[PDB]
Amino acid sequence: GTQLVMYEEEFTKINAVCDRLTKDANAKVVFLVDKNGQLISSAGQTQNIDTTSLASLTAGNVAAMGGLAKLIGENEFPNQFHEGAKDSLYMTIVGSRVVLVVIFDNRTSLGLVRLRIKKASDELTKIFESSPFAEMSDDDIDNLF
Amino acid sequence: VMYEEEFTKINAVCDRLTKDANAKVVFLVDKNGQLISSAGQTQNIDTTSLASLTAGNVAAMGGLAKLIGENEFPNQFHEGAKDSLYMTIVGSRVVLVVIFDNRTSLGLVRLRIKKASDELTKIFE
Amino acid sequence: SFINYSSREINCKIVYYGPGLCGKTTNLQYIYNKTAAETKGKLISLSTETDRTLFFDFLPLSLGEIRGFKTRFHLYTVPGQVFYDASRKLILKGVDGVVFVADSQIERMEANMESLENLRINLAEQGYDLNKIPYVIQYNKRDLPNAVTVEEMRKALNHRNIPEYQAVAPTGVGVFDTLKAVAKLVLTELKK
Ligand SMILES: Nc1nc2c(ncn2[C@@H]2O[C@H](COP(=O)(O)OP(=O)(O)OP(O)(O)=S)[C@@H](O)[C@H]2O)c(=O)[nH]1
Ligand SMILES: [Mg+2]
């Protein structure tokens, strides 16, 4: 694992980008997931829905598409679309290790979603453009369970 | 074995679909992740990895659909640069994978994928 | 690993590795069965119709709190059959700790060694080194009559005297021992 840390400086902005998209594109949910499976942020009606499972399946899906694209001599497909009769889902790779996901009611045209997503993604790379362990001792670890 | 009969008839459907849709290659993958059949330009492609990643992708998409109150998403279209990839679940257990270059329209692949599916759903029966 | 200072959450990824049918998924099912609702998410199992794992199992687990940070462990198992290698490599991305699950049956010793070299290879190919990551080995299926001795599995599989745990995953024996051992090695690594 690459030891990665996120201070409330950049966390607060990332969450703001997300709740923008759910309000504007009338998304039922929005969330942001690392390629390795780690959920970074969500937004929307995340009650009664398991965003931790969603993030894990999403990163698995994207990684499998990643290997397939590489197998037929392509680059990672920049996004994926999946229409549903009730709720549909669109996702896009934002940078080199992140994935933004939007699922929405089909009472919201695909055109409006890929619109707000052009900006939110561009907004997210603008944010990316910008210790508990020091006082820890082995009793803190051994006493964990 | 009448398995010999079925397996050449499966290659037939794949071969017809590769021609009649002007595709680059066609893979028939069990949801198990094992390759059933392949027609077209296969020389420079690891077909074990492709079968494994295909089954994994469909499984992940399925588990995801099941979470957000939608049945297993039937098709996946992943447009690339010089090439494209389309996937469809044929019946219950099999995934059809059509890789086609961008001089071919997705609308023709899907039109031809309809009849291949039924030709396969009835070979299975 | 990923630390959210804002939400005070430490996130770690643990991958269970080993040959087909060796007991990886049984480890996770046991852990899920025995953990209160308040420390676990849902167990995701992407499997075939005969219950072989096809892509991964995933179980998010909370292990308590260290200096007021909640610890979230993201547990994965890989598909163990040889021909799922391409899917198996995907699961190792960003791994913080590895549990290698070995099947103690004499008839599966070569599958164990093949799987262990496959874990070494796969880690090297994405820039990791098994000799340098938190790593424990589980000798599972100790109940079976055809199980080889602990000492013969050590010779075949364990050269650096990596921590080794005997298990019988379906009854839970050794299961939380193994998880506690790799979890603490991961947390000890971050401490450094
Ligand atoms: N006797 C005995 N049986 C075990 C033990 N651990 C697992 N099994 C059995 O072995 C079979 C395989 O277990 P499972 O967890 O599914 O393997 P896996 O490692 O996840 O297998 P795969 O997904 O790579 S194919 C199951 O029937 C399980 O009950 C054990 O410790 N003792
Ligand atoms: Mg399994």
Residue numbers in the entry:
A (entry chain B): 2 to 131, 143 to 157
B (entry chain C): 6 to 130
C (entry chain A): 2 to 193
What does the paper say about this structure?
The localization of motility complexes, and thereby the direction of movement, is determined by an oscillatory system, which includes Mutual gliding motility A (MglA), a small Ras-like GTPase, and Mutual gliding motility B (MglB), its GTPase activating protein (GAP) as major components. In this study, we report the biochemical and structural characterization of M. xanthus MglA and MglB (MxMglA and MxMglB). Thus, MxMglB plays a dual role in increasing the GTPase activity of MxMglA by orienting the catalytic residues (role of a GAP) and by facilitating exchange of GDP with GTP (role of a GEF). Allosteric binding of the C-terminal helix (Ct-helix) of MxMglB on MxMglA facilitates nucleotide exchange.
In the structure, a monomer of MxMglA was bound to a dimer of MxMglB. MxMglA interacts with the MxMglB dimer through an extensive hydrophobic interface involving β2 strand of MxMglA and α2 helices of MxMglB monomers, an interface similar to that of TtMglAB. One of the novel features of the MxMglAB–GTPγS complex is the asymmetry between the 2 protomers of MxMglB (labeled MglB1 and MglB2). In MglB1, the N-terminal amino acids (2–7) comprised a β-strand that formed hydrogen bonds with the β0 strand of MxMglA, thus continuing the central β-sheet of the MxMglA fold. α1 helix of the Rbl/LC7 fold started from Glu11B (residue names with superscript B denote residues of MglB) of MglB1. However, residues 147 to 157 of the MglB1 protomer could be modeled into the electron density, which adopted a helical conformation. Henceforth, this will be referred to as Ct-helix (C-terminal helix of MxMglB). The Ct-helix of MglB1 bound to a pocket in MxMglA distal from the nucleotide-binding site. The binding pocket in MxMglA was formed by the residues of the α5 helix, β2 strand, and the loop connecting β2 and β3 strands (β2–β3 loop) of MxMglA (interswitch region of small Ras-like GTPases). The conformational changes between MxMglA–GDP and the MxMglA–GTPγS bound to MxMglB resulted in movements of switch 1 and switch 2 such that Arg53A and Gln82A of MxMglA are now oriented towards the catalytic water. Analysis of the crystal structure of MxMglAB–GTPγS complex showed that Asp150B, Asp151B, and Asp152B on the MxMglB Ct-helix formed water-mediated as well as direct interactions with MxMglA.
